[PDB]
Amino acid sequence: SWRSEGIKYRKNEVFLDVIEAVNLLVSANGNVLRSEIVGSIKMRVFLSGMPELRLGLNDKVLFDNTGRGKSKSVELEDVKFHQCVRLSRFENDRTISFIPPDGEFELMSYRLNTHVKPLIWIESVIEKHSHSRIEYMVKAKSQFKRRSTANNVEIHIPVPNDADSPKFKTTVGSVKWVPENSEIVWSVKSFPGGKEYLMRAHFGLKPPISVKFEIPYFTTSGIQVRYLKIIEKSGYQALPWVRYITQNGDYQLRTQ
Amino acid sequence: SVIGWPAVRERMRRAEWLEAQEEEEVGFPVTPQVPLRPMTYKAAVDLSHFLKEKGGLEGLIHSQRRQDILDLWIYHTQGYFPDWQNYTPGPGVRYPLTFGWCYKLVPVEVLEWRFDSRLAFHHVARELHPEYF
């Protein structure tokens, strides 16, 4: 909602959600072909009246220009702003300044073409199980911090169109066969960092492996909202809240 | 804080082939509800005085290492983003960018930490570099 005057809330608050999607392309050989973070900040704004907001991030260009280059920042690329943001201010001195809409919306979006390890690594080895029975041994490892946990991770493993009679055995999570998509999907409700899990599958008798996941309480880029300033004419009590979610986006490992 | 400083004070005194390429567990976890914020005037002032009172920083020769020890200590023990202890570029005296921080770096460029209460009132760095603000 475009904020007309005299919006009113019992409690003046903002919630920000820093969401980062990870794009990843690995080769059969394990060579990271491409690797990229696509991030955005969603705001849910519950603010009375007609406030003026200023968003403080560990933006590198800002730090470099404000004598804070020695400090750890994040180099934002292809930044794009919701229309409420005053581009001139951002252009001039990197200020993020805006009168917000009411309710929900995406303040900004950005990229990083940084190349850190894949959060989640898949190895899939194909052996001959019996007869024209074929076996897939697969390892999945979380390469993110032990103190963090991915949720609802799904590992999509393509199998041949003519396979049948799958049988599966896994240490953790669960597997199913999806013939329509001609693949198997290994699901893990909850996957702590610094873990290695194994699944085995065989069948009677390509696309890449892809994985879905979400890691709350966590960023890849290391972006931080330092502060959110709220200036309304009343001079009221407003509170900003923040959280950081990483998730997959386009995460593919080539088989060969 | 208080028991914390003497430990970290010594650490600071102590400070002063190939790079062992460093490895990651990827990413930056955020401890769910613990709030993190930039250093405040009052906190900067209090701390300046605390360190002044207890001694250890005054006349210590500055290095990035030694500063880092300090900033991280405050970060862990107090939740202040360690982007606050920057000083104006030299040469000459280096004035803190954080108004409230009552130390500055004076050539003895080999610099050292020097307390100066005027800095709680005269935001010099802002005079010298309004653009930073």
Binding site: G56, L228, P240, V242, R243 | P35, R37, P38, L97
Partner: peptide
């Protein structure tokens, strides 16, 4: 679950 954020650049 959200963390509370700062209301200004106290540090600058």
């Amino acid at each position: 679950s959200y963390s509370q954020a700062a209301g200004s650049d106290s540090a600058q």
